[PDB]
Amino acid sequence: KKPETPEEQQWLVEAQQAKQGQQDPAMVQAQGVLLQGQAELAKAQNQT
Amino acid sequence: LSLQIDAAKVEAQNQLNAARIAEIFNNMDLSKQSEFREFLKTVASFQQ
């Protein structure tokens, strides 16, 4: 919906920052299975 | 980073190994030359 302040200005739009703030680090974790291939390549090449 | 700091220990091991062997190598070589000059005067006076 986005805030336009029709029922809020400290109410909803405060906790908006907290919900989005919780979402962002958890998204990297979900994408973490794509980082498994990057892990196998990284430590193997350096060790050689 | 753990592979890099571990690899730096091998580098420092060889750098020390080149110096430590060379110190005692020069000391034992010098001892053979030092006693040799003393024996020249011993043999010389003995012949007279």
From Swiss-Prot, chain A:
Annotated localization: Virion
Superkingdom of the source species: Viruses
Signal peptide interval: none
Family note: Belongs to the p22likevirus portal protein family.
Assembly and binders: Homododecamer. Interacts with the terminase large subunit; this interaction allows the packaging of viral DNA. Interacts (via C-terminus) with the head-to-tail adapter protein gp4; this interaction participates in the head completion. Interacts with the scaffolding protein; this interaction initiates procapsid assembly, thereby ensuring incorporation of only one portal ring per capsid. Interacts with the capsid protein.
Job description of the protein: Forms the portal vertex of the capsid. This portal plays critical roles in head assembly, genome packaging, neck/tail attachment, and genome ejection. Procapsid assembly may initiate with a nucleation complex composed of portal and scaffolding proteins. The portal protein multimerizes as a single ring-shaped homododecamer arranged around a central channel. Switches upon genome packaging from an asymmetrical conformation in the procapsid (PC-portal) to a symmetrical ring in the mature capsid (MV-portal). This change of conformation may serve as a signal for headful packaging.
Stated name of the protein: Portal protein
Region of the whole protein represented: 582 to 629 of 725
